[PDB]
Structure formats: structure tokens, C-alpha cells
């Protein structure tokens, strides 16, 4: 549900692929195979996309991988609480209340003067499985 099965040899430098239960980027495939009747193995490296931590695996080319979603979603600012939290506004015309102000200091100030300031701001989160991180702020218009 958070992943999918994918043969490794499907997989390429720029996809997703879980090492040790992360959801990480393909930044390099190799392959690598035992005698001329062997069958290839994928040899990957790749980067934890919210910790940025290289994590490594190889994977025998006809067994799957599980793959991470991971998506990029936009919404309005609604709300920044006193506690950290950040209300922010659904496509639905709900709310979504469960994330904080992220650990990046000139997004969290981006964010804090843009909503003291009366503006439209939209807020990128970044989510795969079950991890979400606020990952960019703009303005798009508004003020008082």
C-alpha cells in the first residue's frame, strides 16, 4: 500500500527503491553477472530522501524490489499554531493538521512572516511511507 513490487532490473537511476525499510532515490545502477549462464544482478546506490543518508543493495535483477510512493502535494497555510503545528488547507476543502514547522529554518521564517503577513502561502510536503517533510514555501499573493 505504501510500496509496490518491481523486478530490480525494471528499476533506474532517478526511481524510488526501500533499502533496510527507507524510502530512497536511485542515484547509480550497475550490473554484474556470474559467468557467461548467469543471470545479472543490480547493484544500486541510492539516497535516503528525508535523511540524505547513501544507503547501498544488490538485488538479483528477476526478484522484485519494493518500491516507495512518494509524492509531491501543495497546500494554503491556514494556520500556524503556538505549539508548531501547521493547519494547512485540503483540495477537498478540508483540513490537515498533523505536520510541524520544518526543522529548515528559512522555510519555517518563510512561513511564520508570510501568514503574520495576510499572504496566500502554499506549502510542498513531500510523503513516502508514512513520513512526510515540509520541503518548499511560496508566496502567491494577498497581504494587509
Known amino acids: 500500500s505504501k510500496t509496490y513490487p518491481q523486478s530490480a532490473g525494471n528499476i533506474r537511476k532517478g526511481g524510488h527503491i526501500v533499502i533496510k525499510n527507507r524510502p530512497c532515490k ?8 556470474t559467468g557467461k549462464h548467469g543471470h545479472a544482478k ?11 543518508k547513501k544507503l547501498e543493495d544488490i538485488v538479483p535483477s528477476s ?6 510512493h512518494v509524492n509531491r502535494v501543495d497546500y494554503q497555510l491556514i494556520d500556524i499554531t503556538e505549539d508548531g503545528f501547521v493547519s494547512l488547507l485540503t483540495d477537498s476543502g ?6 510541524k514547522l520544518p526543522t529548515d529554518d528559512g522555510l519555517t521564517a518563510q512561513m511564520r512572516l508570510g501568514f503574520d ?7 510542498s510536503v513531500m510523503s513516502s511511507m508514512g513520513e512526510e517533510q ?11
Open 26 to 33: 536511485v542515484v547509480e545502477v550497475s550490473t554484474s553477472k
Open 42 to 52: 543490480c547493484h544500486f546506490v541510492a539516497i535516503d530522501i528525508f535523511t540524505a
Open 63 to 68: 526478484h522484485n524490489c519494493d518500491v516507495p
Open 94 to 99: 478540508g483540513t490537515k493538521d498533523d505536520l
Open 117 to 123: 503577513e495576510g499572504k496566500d502561502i502554499v506549502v
Open 134 to 144: 515540509i520541503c518548499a514555501v511560496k508566496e502567491v499573493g494577498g497581504g494587509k
